[PDB]
């Protein structure tokens, strides 16, 4: 509360560390469905169904330009990519499997880097 603060957790390396995680996600072999924004002209249903599209290139640009206020907003956008994928794709599809694999990969790197 006012004039009562928990001890200051060191967040000065968070930007660098989120960038490293994001590089690892970008270079994973199963990243290909997620590298670029879904083409809303070419994919029927996407625009109406997926209210907040998100992709790794968009996260990279937001990261690079100070548009994440803290590491939790960064994780929310990463998780959005996989939540969108599960909304639109069957589990038993190449893309659906890719999304599960990537979410797992991310969540481990997240735990190991920060928790």
UniProtKB/Swiss-Prot annotation:
Q: Say which domain of life the source belongs to.
A: Eukaryota
Residues of the Bromo domain: 9-113
The tissues in which it is expressed are:
Expressed at varying levels in several tissues, whereas a smaller transcript was expressed specifically in testis.
Subcellular location as annotated: Nucleus
Binding partners and assembly: Component of the BRF-1 ISWI chromatin remodeling complex, at least composed of SMARCA1 and BAZ2B, which regulates the spacing of histone octamers on the DNA template to facilitate access to DNA. Within the BRF-1 ISWI chromatin remodeling complex interacts with SMARCA1; the interaction is direct. Component of the BRF-5 ISWI chromatin remodeling complex, at least composed of SMARCA5/SNF2H and BAZ2B, which regulates the spacing of histone octamers on the DNA template to facilitate access to DNA.
Record family assignment: Belongs to the WAL family.
Question: What is known about what this protein does?
Answer: Regulatory subunit of the ATP-dependent BRF-1 and BRF-5 ISWI chromatin remodeling complexes, which form ordered nucleosome arrays on chromatin and facilitate access to DNA during DNA-templated processes such as DNA replication, transcription, and repair. Both complexes regulate the spacing of nucleosomes along the chromatin and have the ability to slide mononucleosomes to the center of a DNA template. The BRF-1 ISWI chromatin remodeling complex has a lower ATP hydrolysis rate than the BRF-5 ISWI chromatin remodeling complex.
Can you name this protein?
A: Bromodomain adjacent to zinc finger domain protein 2B
Q: Which organism is it from?
A: Homo sapiens (Human)
Q: Lineage of the source organism?
A: Eukaryota, Metazoa, Chordata, Craniata, Vertebrata
